[PDB]
């Protein structure tokens, strides 16, 4: 998918612009905010065409209240704000967001245009509240030093878990995807053993082989993130996290981003990471993780996003 | 779309060749002609094969002309010749050509090569009338100094734009080009400032971010070339220019390659660049550019140019 | 199209594994086997993920005889042991593998860690009979000096022509996979001139332009693995081939592979090749390759293989 | 120049990062920055060993008052802290800085983890006072919209302007680097037309060719930043510059950095800049460029480096 | 050595673009010309510096009736026009030329932009008289099918053969540099057998492994190419021969450019081919290439060529 | 530094081979041998010059015996035979070679053609006794995990390390170059914690940090092979290891290859690893690899190499 807005299926990318930014109250900030994003394919193609490969893409997330702002009375099925956790010593609060902009390519140069393009388009008529600059850490590995992204499902399987079908079809195509900026305590996590690391996780650390059924804790990252049924379906989410960071301010992190038909799907990973199965049984990442934000967004496929609202 | 002919939706290239040529007169010439593009994989894969990334692409076009020599049983919906255009200071000339191969590749040296055994294979049964060896100019630019092909249709809409369809489905997945090769008066172009460029084009020259409503005027380039029907719908071509030129002969040029499915839009464009929208408000970019060529050729699917 | 196993239909590659395996006897060893290749997509992302690309492909076949012990019913139409050859000069054996391995990818690296850890996974309960790490050669070249892999389907001709479809529906989506690891004569070719050679292969050595029709040997290695059927249709399979081989054992090899959604279609090539059209009128490629191995597999679909048992 | 320390000669690159250091009052503080920075190779190969090409390199800088703590016995001929500008309209800040860690590589990830790893090796014996993500920005260009370095000192050349030589044997080999963190105002420079912003600089803003002398004003960057002396030598000095912002902050910044074997050259092109020549008419670069840094450090050779 | 005028020592590049010019009559137009070519290293940087790689480089080539109207007085010891050549069937013409200008680069865009400013500052005070696109033609191949350039001296070798050193000391660092433009007959030359070429050549075609002693026959291009004094001192020359062509106008060519700190010996090379040895005893490759065009150059070092005139 | 034979100098590959070759006893065996290791420039640049990039390098190495049937007078102040070692638990064994081909490129096929062309060139002159096809492993790591050849000297270091210098003025520009073929335990090493590796090489595994002075062990590979000597100057050689193996055969090994302007550097640090400093204390890197070969070779400058003979 060349150059096309809400292209939520793109591979993973050296560099990375996460963008979060809030709406102005007024009627003009709305009209100004629609304006721009439901034009997003002109920046787009106007910054990702300089660039021979054309690995720049940009994905559009909205908001519920916003939403509610400029399409009362058309709704996906699943669209509501981020729902906040509350553990006994880690939380993930919810943070505000009306608009995401998920920028990737494979140069920092691209996506900073691109975002630059789109502030500018946006003007006064939004803030932004978090921006991330996310970036490709040695062989796929997040700041804990361990593959990150390995299980992703692809190809149909992709397809499949990602974008909204049937069960929706006036949002066909679209997506739900959450974000969570995570930063890490490096001490701490420096204090374990590479073989208590990989217990924590699920997987070995410099080879990223999955740990056998008898060696894999049902604390492990790995454990809590995999969602079967009571019909034995497994239900997967499209991760795109990268790492970033700030050697000044301290700041190691790891940006979480999952797509999802249903952000159900997510809100059960989130709540067997948070709140444990069985309960207490919670995610030891999160001893060494501290989500700063949390927003959820509607993903609209291109043709909904081009009607926005007008 | 891996080295298979008649690959329209290609991505951009490091390089091209544009080929032009008129068969010969003989049913001798006809069929040589016709054994050579309707097996046109050969050549094809016998060159692209050698490039690990698979790069090599070659469309073939065929023009009205010579179409009706091969297959006056059945005609592709809008196959005409190309359409001369008088208007008050430019003209579009028609100029001949019952060939067209659109090849591009990463590399020159591919691109030449199919080029050598295209042209070995065609013999004395057809000549080359027109050759333009493309190349990208950094950061698709254009020799005008601008950001050029940047609201291509893409993806679905691409192939929405430029193949055929249901409308005519005996040449379903066929399209049609149309080529122009335009040289450029570059010091007239250097005595206009930036901002004089920019109300020509439609675009900043730079950043290449489209001119708000309000700056745009109504003769730029990107104004004349919107196709707005009358439900509200835009209506978009597929362009796959390059860059080319000659320093010694101070030629500075723009190839023109547009494919549609049906190139009325196309033509469209070209009546209101050269004749304006309203009349006599016409394409102020025609004032640094000339056209030295003008052809439309049908593209077969490749079943299609394969039967033939 | 990435990190996906049974991705038959992927572009060539700088760097191949092909690993053959027999599988034990025993029933431990069975299960072992179904538990790594139904979970093949693990490792294949292990791996595939550290690049950034993503190139890497692992395709799975599994031979006629060890499908019979995973799955009793069902089966595909045309799965069987590789049919051996004995022609007038050259001969086709037939050789085990219950396992094929297809690896390929962007580095060496890549490919030889995703064996290692498929050998790793299913220790005990196979073992390796014929391991071969393929190399692009030059401008996609074999040993003998021609451009190789040419004429391969692509696009949707690559889909119909290897791709099980509406006629075999349990398995639509599965293909058949051939294996012959040919060793060359290196110092008997090049006693040939270019030109004997051209007309051994079929097509011009450095331009890899097709020969004409009226200059073209009726036994050339092209005329001889071209298949028109009675209608008049053309019947074609897609080719993997990689170039091995050691200098201190002087093995210059092409390792053949080559997939159809019929192995009809490739045994009818291997017999125009090894016997002769007509009887005799051998693939002279023939009199200076001769294969060590032959195994046939069928290439199930992902859903197919993820079922395993 | 493959994986050395102090290898000031290093072509331009895709990414980079600097950090600037105040080290901490204590004895032992200034221990571990020496064990530091004098087994910097360690750090520098650690990473830049992982990469097949070897971009990575790291060139360090120490300030004039944390030197004259740890060799008060002899001193770099050239060596003082940065002179603060005072200007008619526009003033240079000096800034605190102890410790300069240039670094450069083919991406960001590598930047970032030699940085990483210096940091924590220094702990709590220093702290970061200023640190900016370089980032090359399509062909060359700075955020002014300029291809930014063109005139950089290239080879022999580039030693001869960068390199300390027989003028003070003891420090050959090493250097002298002064950074400045620029911020530009940004929609202040989009007022100006191309034109206009071409004749601040001194060259054309797409193409880069220099502006004949007689279009060239008095008070361009580029003739201001030309330095002659009366045997009509031009002194040079080499400059890598990077790009760098954050859009939330609406911070868009080209940080300065300069090499010379005399800093002399460098401090003279500043105050030509901030003052003027003649006084009065300064840099209307600086009319869209603020300098939030501005510290002077001196680089030792590798054996230097090594015996701190 | 990075965006430096006069780097004869580059590498093979993708891309080359040899221009060849004739300066006007008057003692303006000589002004002209002297004040470009002396700052030609502007435009070298004002192009190369917008490609990260730095692959671009251009050498200036000075005819030897230009030199001596600019520099009279100082003449490097062997700048003489190109010496013309008239063999039974084969000719080597001597054609008009002032100017060189030698570029080479990874992109064709590079090259096309920096001969574009240099004609462009050059103006109405010079004429193009030949203009040739090089590409690299698959492996390192010229259009007759063989890889072309193998035998190049490299290291000290290359430094040893081209540039100027003591003989000369006024000229040191500078080089003499020979181009002809040949056109080859690509009918005749299929005619051949692959062996047939083999022995013309005097390496094999695929494989490009020189033929033994045995095999290698008295007027193979290889056997005339190849400089051997009475001491037994081999002298080499550096070439940077590129494939050129035109589709349309039949003409598939070799662009020759050789560089030698003494032109004697590749005035030697070039009669060993036209004349032969023994006489007659030609180079076939003749046969099939015929040059259209020879001029010889002189390639001042930097500081040389920055003193013009002024 | 671009296709010229004896580049020693020469930056990671991504691909290798490695031919140790023992001569004919013939005296036509010895003047073949010469003219194709006198005249390596030829095929370096036949098969370099088709790579756009160039980074094809080969360097000729040859041993003592051989050197000694070839140049009466003169010979390197320090060629010798492979000291071989027999340690408390580990031993090197010395075996046999007389010609070393250390060719590196960024592709296989660059590497293999080469080396199929000196082989072919040396005909019945010559046989080979070792192959090795290395290979980059990741991020520069050898197949124990951990990142290999980090320590390196580089630039006007690496020269003075490797490269024979004013104290053997004949042979200025040659260096000494020795050859270990290791294969490793693989299960062993993986019974090991990443922190005890970590004890065994000297240095964290991810991350390739050097351990602490107070956390080094006195028998970690690093330790053993730093040497300073008396008036405190250390000494360093130059490697240019590369993973390789088979899966088949479970062989995973580390080439080593380590050039030095005095193999005593060389020698010392492999006395240090097998018998241990103090004695008894020796490389635990031993105890999951084991040389199979073991040979010493000299690098003669580009003139020395051309004069034979
Ligand atoms: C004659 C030389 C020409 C030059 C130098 C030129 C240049 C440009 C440039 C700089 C743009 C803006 C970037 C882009 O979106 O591609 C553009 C847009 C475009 N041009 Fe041209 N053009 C030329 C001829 C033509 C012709 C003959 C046609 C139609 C037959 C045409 C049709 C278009 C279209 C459809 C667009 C996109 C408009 C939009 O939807 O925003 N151009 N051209
Ligand atoms: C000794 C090992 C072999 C060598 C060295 C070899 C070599 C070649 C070459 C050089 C070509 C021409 C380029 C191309 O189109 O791919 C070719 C074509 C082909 N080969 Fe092979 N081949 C070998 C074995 C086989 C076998 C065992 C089969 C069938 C089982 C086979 C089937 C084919 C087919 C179907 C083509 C394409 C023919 C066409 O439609 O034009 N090859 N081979
Ligand atoms: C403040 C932000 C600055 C910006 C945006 C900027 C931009 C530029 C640009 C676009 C050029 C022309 C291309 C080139 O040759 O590099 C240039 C040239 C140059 N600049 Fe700057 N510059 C800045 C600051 C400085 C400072 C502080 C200095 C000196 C301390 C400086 C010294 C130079 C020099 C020496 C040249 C080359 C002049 C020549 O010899 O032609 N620049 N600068
Ligand atoms: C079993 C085969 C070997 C393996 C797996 C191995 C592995 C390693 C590793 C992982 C390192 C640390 C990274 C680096 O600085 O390169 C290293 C360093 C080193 N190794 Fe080896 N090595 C092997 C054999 C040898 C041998 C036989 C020698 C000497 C003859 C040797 C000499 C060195 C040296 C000199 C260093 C750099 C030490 C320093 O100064 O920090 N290695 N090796
Ligand atoms: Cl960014
Ligand atoms: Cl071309
Ligand atoms: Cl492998
Ligand atoms: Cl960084
Ligand atoms: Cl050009
Ligand atoms: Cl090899």
Chains 1, 5 share one sequence.
Request: hydrophobic residues 40%; negative net charge; charged residues 25%.
């Amino acid at each position: 998918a060349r150059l096309a807005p809400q292209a939520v299926l793109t591979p993973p990318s050296a560099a990375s612009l996460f963008l979060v930014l809030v709406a102005g109250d007024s009627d003009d900030d709305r009209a100004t905010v629609c304006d721009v994003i439901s034009g997003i394919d002109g920046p787009l193609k106007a910054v990702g065409f300089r660039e021979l490969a054309g690995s720049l893409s940009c994905v559009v997330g909205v908001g519920a209240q916003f939403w509610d702002r400029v399409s009362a009375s058309s709704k996906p099925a699943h669209l509501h704000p981020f729902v906040p956790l509350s553990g006994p010593v880690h939380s993930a609060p919810s943070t505000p967001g009306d608009l995401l902009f998920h920028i990737k390519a494979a140069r920092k140069d691209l996506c900073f245009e691109l975002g630059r393009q789109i502030v500018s388009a946006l003007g006064s008529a939004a803030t932004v509240v978090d921006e991330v600059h996310g970036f490709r850490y040695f062989d796929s590995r997040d700041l804990l030093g361990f593959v990150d992204g390995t299980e992703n499902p692809t190809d149909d399987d992709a397809a499949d878990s990602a974008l909204i079908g049937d069960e929706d079809p006036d949002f066909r195509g679209g997506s739900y995807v959450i974000v969570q900026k995570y930063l890490h305590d490096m001490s701490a996590w420096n204090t374990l053993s590479t073989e208590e690391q990989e217990r924590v996780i699920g997987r070995t650390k410099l080879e990223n082989v999955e740990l056998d059924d008898d060696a894999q804790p049902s604390n492990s990252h790995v454990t809590l993130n995999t969602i079967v049924d009571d019909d034995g379906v497994e239900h997967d989410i499209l991760l795109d996290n990268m790492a970033f960071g700030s050697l000044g301010e301290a700041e190691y992190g790891t940006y979480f981003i999952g797509y999802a038909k249903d952000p159900a799907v997510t809100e059960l990973m989130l709540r067997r990471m948070f709140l444990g199965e069985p309960p207490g049984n919670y995610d030891r990442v999160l001893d060494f993780s501290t989500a700063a934000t949390g927003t959820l967004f509607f993903v609209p496929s291109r043709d909904v996003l081009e009607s926005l609202g007008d």
